[PDB]
Amino acid sequence: MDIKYDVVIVGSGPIGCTYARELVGAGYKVAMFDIGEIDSGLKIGAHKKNTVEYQKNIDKFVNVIQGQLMSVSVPVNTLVVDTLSPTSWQASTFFVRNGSNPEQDPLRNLSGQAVTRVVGGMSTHWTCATPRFDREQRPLLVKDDADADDAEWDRLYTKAESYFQTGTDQFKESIRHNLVLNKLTEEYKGQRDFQQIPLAATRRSPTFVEWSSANTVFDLQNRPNTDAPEERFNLFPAVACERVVRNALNSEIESLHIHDLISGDRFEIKADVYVLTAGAVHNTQLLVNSGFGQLGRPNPANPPELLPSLGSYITEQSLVFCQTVMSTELIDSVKSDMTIRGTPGELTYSVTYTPGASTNKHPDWWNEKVKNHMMQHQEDPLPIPFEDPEPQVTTLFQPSHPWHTQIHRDAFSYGAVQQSIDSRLIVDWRFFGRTEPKEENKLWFSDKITDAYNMPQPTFDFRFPAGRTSKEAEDMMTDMCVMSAKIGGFLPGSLPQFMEPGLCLHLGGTHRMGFDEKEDNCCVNTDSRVFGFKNLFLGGCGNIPTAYGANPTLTAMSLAIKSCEYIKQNFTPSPF
Binding-site positions for FAD: 15, 34, 118, 121-122, 125, 127-129, 241, 553
Count the residues of the shown chain that bind ligand FDA, applying the rule CB under 6 A: 38
Selected catalytic residue, list 215, 283, 289, 551: 551
273 forms part of the interface with ligand FDA (CB under 6 A): no
Nearer to ligand FDA, 279 or 514 (CB): 279
Could you tell me if 286 and 19 are in contact, meaning their C-beta atoms sit under 8 angstroms apart?
no
350 interface partner picked from ligand SHG, ligand FDA, a second copy, none, CB below 5 to 8 A per type: none
Q: Provide the residue count of the chain.
A: 576
Is 506 a residue of the active site?
yes
Binding site for ligand SHG (CB under 6 A): 127, 129, 406, 410, 430, 503-505, 551
460 interface partner picked from ligand FDA, a second copy, ligand SHG, none, CB below 5 to 8 A per type: a second copy
Tell me how far, at minimum, the Cβ of 450 lies from a second copy, in Å. 10
319 forms part of the interface with ligand FDA (CB under 6 A): no
Distance CA 439, CA 240 (A): 30
On the CB side of 466, CA atoms within 13 Å amount to 1
Among the listed residues 46, 110, 141, 241, the single contact to ligand FDA using CB under 6 A: 241
Nearer to ligand SHG, 212 or 551 (CB): 551
Per residue, what are the HEC states of 460-522? EECCCCCCHHHHHHHHHHHHHHHHHCCCEEEECCECCEECCCCCCCCCECCCCECCCCCCCCC
Tell me how far, at minimum, the Cβ of 14 lies from ligand FDA, in Å. 5
421 interface partner picked from a second copy, ligand SHG, ligand FDA, none, CB below 5 to 8 A per type: a second copy
How many CB atoms neighbour CB 257 within 10 A? 17
Distance CA 32, CA 274 (A): 10
15 interface partner picked from a second copy, ligand FDA, ligand SHG, none, CB below 5 to 8 A per type: ligand FDA
**SS3 of 67, please?**
helix
Nearer to ligand FDA, 389 or 552 (CB): 552
Residues forming beta bridges with residue 4, ordered by sequence position:
270
DSSP letter for 122, please. G
Nearer to a second copy, 398 or 419 (CB): 419
Distance CA 570, CA 566 (A): 6
CA distances from 158 to 151, 163, 388 (A): 10, 9, 30
Tell me how far, at minimum, the Cβ of 328 lies from a second copy, in Å. 4
Selected catalytic residue, list 506, 511, 525, 535: 506
Query: Burial, 359: exposed, middle or buried (Cβ in 10 Å; 0-12, 13-18, 19+)?
Result: exposed
Concatenate the DSSP letters of all residues of 174-187 into one string. Answer: -HHHHHHHHHHHHH
123 interface partner picked from a second copy, ligand SHG, ligand FDA, none, CB below 5 to 8 A per type: ligand FDA
Nearer to ligand SHG, 121 or 385 (CB): 121
CA distances from 35 to 9, 38, 164, 259, 297 (A): 12, 10, 23, 9, 26
Tell me how far, at minimum, the Cβ of 410 lies from ligand SHG, in Å. 5
- The residue with its CB nearest to ligand SHG is 127
456 forms part of the interface with ligand FDA (CB under 6 A): no
DSSP letter for 315, please. B
**SS3 of 280, please?**
helix
Distance CA 353, CA 351 (A): 7
Nearer to ligand SHG, 128 or 244 (CB): 128
Range 275-304, binding ligand FDA (CB under 6 A): 277-279, 282, 286
313 forms part of the interface with ligand FDA (CB under 6 A): no
The binding site comprises 15, 34, 118, 121-122, 125, 127-129, 241, 553
Among the listed residues 7, 8, 15, 351, the single contact to ligand FDA using CB under 6 A: 15
Question: In sequence order, what are the residues at sequence separation of 6 or more whose Cβ sits closer than 8 angstroms to the Cβ of residue 402?
Answer: 136, 433, 434, 472, 476, 549
Distance CA 50, CA 64 (A): 12
Could you tell me if 488 and 330 are in contact, meaning their C-beta atoms sit under 8 angstroms apart?
yes
Q: Which of 117, 122, 126, 57 is nearest to 413 (CA)?
A: 57
Tell me how far, at minimum, the Cβ of 271 lies from a second copy, in Å. 24
241 interface partner picked from a second copy, ligand FDA, ligand SHG, none, CB below 5 to 8 A per type: ligand FDA
How would you classify the pairing of strands 392-394 and 403-408? antiparallel
Could you tell me if 540 and 533 are in contact, meaning their C-beta atoms sit under 8 angstroms apart?
no
How would you classify the pairing of strands 208-211 and 199-205? antiparallel
Choices 12-20, 297-305, 345-353, 489-497; region in contact with ligand FDA by CB under 6 A: 12-20
Among the listed residues 32, 273, 384, 505, the single contact to ligand FDA using CB under 6 A: 505
508 forms part of the interface with ligand FDA (CB under 6 A): no
504 interface partner picked from a second copy, ligand FDA, ligand SHG, none, CB below 5 to 8 A per type: ligand SHG
Range 29-68, binding ligand FDA (CB under 6 A): 33-36, 65
Tell me how far, at minimum, the Cβ of 562 lies from a second copy, in Å. 32
Tell me how far, at minimum, the Cβ of 320 lies from ligand FDA, in Å. 16
Nearer to ligand SHG, 126 or 533 (CB): 126
Could you tell me if 18 and 564 are in contact, meaning their C-beta atoms sit under 8 angstroms apart?
yes
Could you tell me if 115 and 282 are in contact, meaning their C-beta atoms sit under 8 angstroms apart?
yes
Nearer to ligand SHG, 58 or 295 (CB): 58
Breaks (C-N over 2.5 A) in the chain follow: none
Range 105-134, binding ligand FDA (CB under 6 A): 116-118, 121-123, 125-130
How many CB atoms neighbour CB 99 within 10 A? 11
Nearer to ligand SHG, 65 or 523 (CB): 65
Catalytic residues, by residue number, are: 506, 551
Residues at the site binding ligand FDA, with contacts judged by CB under 6 A? 10-16, 33-36, 65, 116-118, 121-123, 125-130, 240-241, 277-279, 282, 286, 505, 540-541, 551-553, 556
